[PDB]
């Protein structure tokens, strides 16, 4: 089968994600992260555009439509409920919720989100801290890479967003170094846009610029 | 999106589900059933036959090869263990569960089914009563006591009077009509229920409970039931 399950979807949740990294949302972005070519990002874009879900910019970046919003929300919040299920119900590890939910965020019905409100007890985040999205419409902080140059910090982690859980190799350090949502980490920023998140007496974890946006954290 | 989410494995499942029917598993059933043109199913059973998931026999019916018996028991088991869970711990009606494990069944990993089997108490069978397949590829090994009793599909009980029965299984073609699906449910035809049974003249059967209506089954989904006689 199509492998993204739902190719259009994970357009809307791609650039909704861009969003929540504080980048800008690009086709190039999307084409390297849903491994797609160029010239196939670029028509299915454009087929969206026609559709009404997205606007193209003169300077490229691409923008949600107020439809393409409520789509992208919804999508979304299928995902971090799913997640939440994954990793407090059915006892999933933690670092393979996110590939799962990718799947099953594309084919939950709002009558199982609906049931998961009221079976999760109405949670209010994700797994990885990240706000559930669109609960209104259902029917019921700093980023790590605004930290001054060369010098340690006392941080709070809050939360982990989606780019960062597609690194399953990564977000397993970050898992076993203690870096999870709510728990206190000192990090170090790296010359070269790169973050550290350093570890007493072994070798610290070091988070691309890409990863230091998808993590937020709060000043203590 | 692709409304069958993973054609391939609709394919195979419905082969399974034919089979579990007692009817031959033909390309037409596959096409009403599927809601593709005869030339579509046509060219995806050649693919899948060139890629080794099935065969066309002599007489035309549709045999899954090993290999694709396989991939079809482990769709029908994630499309079991999905409903199970629907049912005992989302709480989503019974009638519904259906459709949503019908999505499902195609995205769910192996990973998440050995979390299934335990989380859900070590489950064998659907809510509608049918037995849950390949479960020793998922590391369950076989309890004491063997699958089976005496069971009937309704389409083998004889013309006569009325029969009283225990329903046991619904397959997943009845469960796919979502109005009689609904139907039953609400005239409380579930498993283990018991109810009276007459033949009706065109091969269909007609299932008598107190206190609710009629439900006639056309033949075709007589074959979805199984029943023990009382
Ligand atoms: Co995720
Ligand atoms: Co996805
Ligand atoms: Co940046
Ligand atoms: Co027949
Ligand atoms: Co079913
Ligand atoms: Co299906």
Request: net charge negative; charged share 25%.
């Amino acid at each position: 089968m199509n492998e993204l399950v739902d190719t259009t979807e994970m357009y809307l949740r791609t650039i909704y994600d861009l969003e929540e990294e504080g980048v800008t949302p690009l086709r190039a972005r999307i084409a390297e992260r849903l491994d797609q070519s160029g010239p196939t990002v670029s028509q299915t874009v454009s087929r969206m555009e026609r559709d009404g879900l997205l606007r193209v910019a003169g300077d490229r970046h691409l923008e949600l439509t107020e439809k393409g919003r409520a789509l992208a929300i919804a999508v979304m919040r299928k995902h971090r409920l799913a997640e939440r299920l994954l990793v407090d119900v059915i006892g999933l590890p933690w670092e393979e919720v996110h590939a799962e939910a990718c799947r099953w965020e594309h084919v939950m019905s709002e009558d199982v989100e609906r049931r998961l409100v009221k079976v999760l007890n109405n949670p209010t985040t994700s797994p990885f801290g990240n706000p559930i999205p669109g609960l209104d419409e259902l029917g019921v902080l700093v980023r790590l890479t605004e930290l001054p140059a060369g010098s340690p910090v006392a941080v709070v982690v809050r939360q982990l967003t989606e780019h960062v859980q597609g690194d399953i190799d990564l977000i397993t350090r970050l898992k076993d170094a203690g870096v999870v949502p709510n728990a206190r980490v000192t990090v170090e920023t790296t010359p070269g846009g790169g973050v550290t998140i350093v570890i007493p007496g072994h070798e610290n974890v070091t988070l691309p610029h890409e990863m230091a946006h998808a993590v937020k954290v709060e000043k203590v």
